[PDB]
């Protein structure tokens, strides 16, 4: 339509995020809106390494915890109305959808 | 106002870990199994899974509204920006937290441990778990502590399928002689519909179609 | 004046100013990402917080 | 020894020991100034010490 | 402990208004996040109202959570001079 | 229906708060131009007490109700525990209960207000 819409999607899981992204790009391609995406940002790897022992005895053994944040960007050209009409389907838990209107 | 995507996912995790702790301490004797946070655009709907879903609701839903308002003020939500529901745990036998708490109250009362642990095992196996295991550690009868295992069925211990097939809980009983430990590990069966258990079959399981 | 000599030492910084958000102990505190949990408490709640061990 | 604690000095009926309504007639006759501070009312008597007018509710003081 | 009538009525009005109270274990907050009373007075007065069964108390993650009981809704409505 | 029966209005005043009991405070309750009634108890021994309080109340214009039995003055003013229904109260003796602000429940107040007028 007129404006430029960037939908940022973030999640801790790949399958939920990818199927939400597939729903968005499928809805965009049904309403004949041009869609640039999904564009996969580099995955963020939040890492915590701590001594497993609750005290200071034993072999100093380390567990490495990881949280992986996956970011997806979808770039449509349209009006806000169709954008909130598309991003109103059941977004699965953990997926953070974020809509921003550009020029 | 701008919060990083890292700080935000760590904050959601910490909020989940704190909510479940306060609900575990509050809705203890209501059969609280777990909480399912669901951040919808209008409000952050919060679903509570319990066994006594009339004890958590309260008289005309007084308790549930009290919890909803406590969560709103404590966690700093916008007013009417959080709504705590309370659903029914479908299969209590296949939940290790429900059975851990049931065995907790079955021992706080005074019932013999060897008779309540086998009762928990019985109920789990009639519920349908492929295998169940109960561990009771502490000053059971004498001053020296010992650990009594109660295993029945098939139970895997190693590999990735453990964190898909083993539903486990660890609960303390605060007794007169000290603290008693309860480890309940329930092994689930492969559910094609993914309701009673995992949807992915065990990796080593091979099925040959008959000619 | 007792109120100006009670908790009168500054708590702007130091280990005795930050506490575990789950227990209040000030030792082995993981300040990374804003977790504010102690090592032992994070190791216990890590699964709830969302940290998975793959390696 | 054990440092003893300050105990409230107890003067029997200090309000009676404040105004001088006597000589029949009708003269309240305050005998201690009422602290000027606005919040401090008119029944708020500024104690006088061997050389200072001290208000108890606040700290306004005057020496001589 | 010694809590002015202003502060006491202050914490007792909010409790009756909402039916719940919370605080962090912080005896020097100098101001409760909602009530204009420091956290110490709220915590101590809530402990009193609890040894009297006037509330239920649960402590979790360094935070207090108090819930007014049916006896509390009676004693507060008597104390606050109004329903 | 008047005088003695009007302890009820002061019951309501104590409920809604406003009883500035005791002389130390009575005075203050007067000069702060907030006194409205000033029940007294003639049982008090010290003459200077009654002289002084009457002097302050004459300085302003609020009212003076006399009542005997300062023990009962403590009873009416809440200077006691309700105890049981029989009220085995360890009563404290009062000798001035300035009704600053006054209970706003009205009722007998109007009737005592008449006695207040005269
Ligand atoms: Mg292996
Ligand atoms: Zn900790
Ligand atoms: Zn002053």
Swiss-Prot record, chain C:
Top-rank lineage group of the source organism: Eukaryota
Keyword presence, Ribonucleoprotein: yes
Binding site for Zn(2+): 20, 23, 38, 41
Textual note on the cofactor: Binds 1 zinc ion per subunit.
GO CC annotation terms, alphabetical: cytosolic small ribosomal subunit
Cofactor(s) required for function per UniProt: Zn(2+)
Keywords from the UniProt entry: Metal-binding, Ribonucleoprotein, Ribosomal protein, Zinc
Molecular function in Gene Ontology: structural constituent of ribosome; zinc ion binding
Keyword ATP-binding: no
Pfam family, one: Ribosomal_S14
Gene Ontology process terms (BP): cytoplasmic translation
Matches recorded under InterPro entries: Ribosomal_uS14, RIbosomal_uS14_euk_arc, Ribosomal_uS14_sf
Family: Belongs to the universal ribosomal protein uS14 family.
Protein name (Swiss-Prot/TrEMBL): Small ribosomal subunit protein uS14
Species of the source: Triticum aestivum (Wheat)
Lineage start: Eukaryota, Viridiplantae, Streptophyta, Embryophyta, Tracheophyta
Gene name of this polypeptide: RPS29
């Amino acid at each position: 339509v007129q404006h430029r819409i960037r939908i940022t999607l973030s999640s801790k899981s790949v399958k939920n995020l990818e199927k939400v992204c597939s729903d968005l790009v499928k809805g965009a391609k049904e309403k004949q809106l041009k869609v640039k995406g999904p564009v996969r940002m580099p995955t963020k790897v939040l890492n915590i390494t701590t001594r497993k022992s609750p005290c200071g005895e034993g072999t100093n053994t380390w567990d490495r915890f990881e949280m992986r944040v996956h970011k997806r960007v979808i770039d449509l050209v349209s009006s806000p109305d169709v954008v909130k009409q598309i991003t109103s389907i059941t977004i699965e838990p953990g997926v953070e959808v974020e809509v921003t209107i550009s020029d | 106002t701008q919060i990083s995507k890292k700080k935000k996912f760590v904050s959601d995790g910490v909020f989940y870990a704190e909510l479940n702790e306060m609900l575990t301490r509050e809705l203890a004797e209501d059969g609280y199994s777990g909480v399912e946070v669901r951040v919808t655009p209008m409000r952050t709907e919060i679903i509570i899974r319990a066994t006594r879903t009339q004890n958590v609701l309260g008289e005309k839903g007084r308790r549930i509204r009290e919890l909803t308002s406590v969560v709103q003020k404590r966690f700093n939500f916008p007013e009417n920006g959080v709504e705590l529901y309370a659903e029914k745990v479908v299969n209590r036998g296949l939940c290790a937290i429900a059975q851990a708490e049931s065995l907790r109250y079955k021992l706080l009362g005074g019932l013999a441990v060897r008779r309540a642990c086998y009762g928990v095992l019985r109920f789990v196996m009639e519920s349908g778990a492929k295998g169940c295991e109960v561990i009771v550690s502490g000053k059971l009868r004498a001053q020296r502590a010992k650990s009594m295992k109660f295993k029945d069925g098939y139970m895997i211990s190693s590999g990735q399928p453990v964190n898909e097939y083993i539903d486990a809980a660890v609960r303390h009983v605060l007794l007169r002689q000290g603290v008693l430990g309860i480890k309940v590990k329930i092994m689930l069966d492969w559910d094609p519909k993914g309701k009673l258990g995992p949807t992915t079959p065990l990796p080593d399981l091979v099925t040959i179609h008959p000619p | 004046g007792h109120s100006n000599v009670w908790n009168s030492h500054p708590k702007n910084y130091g280990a005795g100013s930050r506490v575990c958000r789950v227990c209040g102990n000030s030792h082995g505190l993981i300040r990374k990402y804003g977790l504010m949990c102690c090592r032992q408490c994070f190791r216990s709640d890590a699964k709830d917080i969302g940290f998975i061990k793959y390696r | 020894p054990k440092k003893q604690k300050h105990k409230h000095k107890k003067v029997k009926l200090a309000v009676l020991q404040f105004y001088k309504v006597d000589d029949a007639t009708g003269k309240v006759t305050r005998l201690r100034k009422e602290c000027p501070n606005a919040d401090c009312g008119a029944g708020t008597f500024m104690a006088n010490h061997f050389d200072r007018h001290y208000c108890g509710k606040c700290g306004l003081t005057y020496v001589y | 402990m010694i809590i002015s009538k202003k502060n006491r009525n202050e914490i007792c009005k909010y409790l009756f208004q909402e039916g719940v109270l919370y605080a962090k274990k912080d005896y020097n907050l100098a101001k409760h996040p909602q009530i204009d009373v420091p956290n110490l007075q709220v915590i101590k007065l809530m402990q009193s109202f609890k040894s009297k069964e006037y509330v239920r108390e649960t402590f979790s993650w360094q935070h207090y959570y108090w819930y007014l009981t049916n006896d509390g809704i009676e004693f507060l409505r008597n104390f606050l001079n109004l329903p | 229906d008047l005088m003695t029966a009007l302890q009820l209005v002061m019951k309501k005043s104590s409920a809604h708060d406003g009883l500035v009991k005791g002389l130390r405070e009575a005075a203050k309750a007067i000069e702060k131009h907030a006194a409205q009634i000033c029940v007294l108890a003639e049982d008090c021994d010290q003459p200077d007490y009654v002289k002084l309080v009457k002097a302050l109340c004459a300085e302003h214009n609020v009212h003076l109700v006399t009542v005997p039995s300062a023990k009962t003055l403590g009873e009416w003013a809440g200077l006691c525990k309700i105890d049981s229904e029989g009220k085995a109260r360890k009563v404290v003796g009062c000798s001035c209960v300035v009704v600053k602000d006054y209970g706003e429940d009205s009722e007998g107040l109007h009737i005592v207000q008449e006695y207040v007028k005269s």
